[PDB]
C-alpha cells in the first residue's frame, strides 16, 4: 500500500 506525504503517494 502506498503512503501519502505532503500530498503525494509513494512507496513505504
Amino acid at each position, epitope marked *: 500500500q*502506498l503512503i501519502n506525504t505532503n500530498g*503525494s*503517494w509513494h512507496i513505504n
Partner: antibody
Amino acid sequence: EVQLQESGPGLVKPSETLSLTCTVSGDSITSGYWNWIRQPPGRALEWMGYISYSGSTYYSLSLRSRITISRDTSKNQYSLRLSSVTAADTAMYYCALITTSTYAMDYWGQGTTVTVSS
Amino acid sequence: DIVLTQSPSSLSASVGDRVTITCRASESVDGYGYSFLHWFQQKPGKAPKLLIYLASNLNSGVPSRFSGSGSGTDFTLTISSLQPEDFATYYCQQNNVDPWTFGQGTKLEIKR
C-alpha cells in the same frame, strides 16, 4: 461499516475560532486518512487537510496559518480548528475518509453547516 | 497551483441519453502506474458519493452505466444511458499533487 459524523456549533463570530469534531464508528482511526472538506453555499468542494492513521498531517497551503487537525483515538474522533474566521469560511463542512482500497475519499459524513456572522 | 478544469460546466440531457464530462489537469496526476483522479456525484443537500476511483475503477455498488477513462492530464466520465436519478453535480478530484483540489463541478439537468 465505517460511519463518520460531524458535530459542533453552527454559528461562529468573525475573528473567532471555528471548531468541529468528526466522530467515527465501525472502523478505528488508526487506519486510513481522515480529511476535512468544505463547500460554500452553491460553490465547489474544497479540500482543507488530513490527519493520517499515524498522526501525520497534510494541510492546504492557503489555510496553513489558521488550521489544525487533531485526533483522539480513545474517543475515535478527529477535529478541525480554524482560527480568525471570516465570511469566506461560511460553508458546509464534511469529514471524509480515504482508504488504501481506492486511494480516494470513499466514505463521507453527512456534513454540518457553519455560518460566520455577528 | 494545479488546477482541474471540467467541461462542460452544465448540460441538459433526456433520459437514456449518453453523457460525457471531461476533466483536464494542468499537470500530471499520475504516480506509480496510477492516475489519482476520482469522480464524485453530489445530489442536492447531500455529501458527494464516490463513483470512479483511480481514473477508471467503478466504485462498489455504482451502476455499470458509469465509467471513467484517461491518463496523465486528460480524463472523462461517461454515463452510457442516463437514468432520472443521475440528476446531480459531478466533480473530479485529484489527490497526488500538492495542493489537492476538486474541479468546479458539472451540473446535469434532465429534460422531459
